[PDB]
From a paper:
During phage infection, bacterial [name] sense c-di-[name] generated by the CD-NTase (cGAS/DncV-like nucleotidyltransferase) encoded in the same operon and signal suicide commitment as a defense strategy that restricts phage propagation. The structure of MySTING was then solved by MR using the refined model of PcSTING. Both PcSTING and MySTING crystals contained two nearly identical protomers with root-mean-square deviations (RMSDs) of 0.29 Å and 0.64 Å for 158 and 160 matched Cα pairs in the asymmetric unit, forming canonical V-shaped dimers of [name] domain. Here, our structures demonstrate that the symmetric recognition of single c-di-[name] by dimeric bacterial [name] proteins is dictated by the guanidinium group of arginine residue (R233/R230 in PcSTING/MySTING) that recognizes the O6 and N7 atoms of guanine base, the backbone oxygen and amide group (H238/H235 in PcSTING/MySTING) that form three hydrogen bonds to the Watson-Crick edge of guanine base and the aspartate residue (D252/D251 in PcSTING/MySTING) that binds to the N2 atom of guanine base.
Author numbering:
A (entry chain B): 147 to 313
B (entry chain A): 150 to 313
Write the structure that this text describes.
């Protein structure tokens, strides 16, 4: 029945819902809509999408993702989609050893969580306390859990998507 | 009572400002001059259009709105991200201002949050759900405007309006 209470969620839950709906699902639908995908003069019929959750929660995950992609020598790839007026931009491994197109992303939306955490702590000093680190790790775990639960509900995503932790 | 938990509109507005608004402003101010298809612009204005109604899929609503406004896609390169920015602009303007537009797709997430919050057992939106949706759209707009006030570029060149 009716519950007294205010609208309120973990930031990781809302950000993971958005990430699944507006990137994961459209990637899977694009790759399953085309009977075959071709990139850089090579054809791919099988795909894997790996979502890399950052090991530490930095406010700027765009920088962290750039560093991670550079370290792994992954390069940009553009995948067309009919669900959006601009294509999907992700990373892939041109050094793969199979006929599977291995795609990767580190969700930049995660960065926002850090801001939320700071407001929760009413931070008055420079530096991350072990309490802030604990809250960050808890949020990273919840983001991963929510994403995996959403992936389990979709046949496309369950077939081709995995979620791992950085390093 | 003292647990981490926020309005979805707050979280989504923070993400939208950091990972789109600010990077648009920074990319466009890096350029020594603004040019598209050989035309020169002396200013740019970025207009963020908040939806009138809260649909789960804001891309569809944005497509309808942009089609009504005869706005077309534009790709803006950026060094703040490993892929360029994609928004809409007015190719039929004649006044030397680069008119850029976006309807925040991230807003769609609010709908899901509200639906789970309502413990819905029937098809249809009660007036309480609609009131909550409108309140969340207002809070998204307010949070975005407060974030824009903290940046000289965004304060100067970004505006936030409601659809229609
Ligand atoms: N590697 C990669 N990741 C993607 C892509 N599309 C979405 N994502 C990821 O999914 C998250 C949610 O995207 P959104 O719901 O559309 O919510 C987006 C979206 O509403 C907007 N936004 C960001 N970039 C753009 C853009 O280039 N064009 C437009 N029209 N909106 C953008 O800002 C919001 C927040 O974006 P993020 O915090 O960065 O968070 C994004 C990002 O982590 C993609 O093409 N490539």
């Amino acid at each position: 029945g009716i519950h007294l209470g205010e609208l309120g969620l973990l930031p990781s839950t809302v950000l993971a819902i958005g990430y699944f709906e507006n990137l994961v699902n459209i990637i899977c639908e694009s790759l399953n809509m085309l009977p075959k995908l071709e990139v850089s003069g090579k054809e791919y019929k099988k795909f894997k999408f790996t979502i890399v959750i950052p090991k530490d929660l930095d406010a700027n995950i765009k920088k962290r993702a750039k560093i991670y992609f550079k370290q792994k020598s992954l390069i940009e790839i553009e995948i067309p989609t009919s669900s959006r007026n601009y294509p999907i931009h992700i990373q892939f491994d041109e050094n793969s050893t199979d006929d599977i197109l291995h795609l990767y992303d580190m969700p930049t939306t995660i960065g926002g969580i850090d801001k939320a955490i700071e407001m929760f702590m009413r931070k008055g000093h420079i530096g991350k306390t072990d309490q802030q680190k604990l809250l960050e790790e808890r949020e990273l775990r919840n983001f991963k859990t929510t994403l995996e639960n959403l992936i389990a509900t979709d046949a496309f995503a369950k077939e081709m998507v995995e979620v791992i932790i950085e390093e």
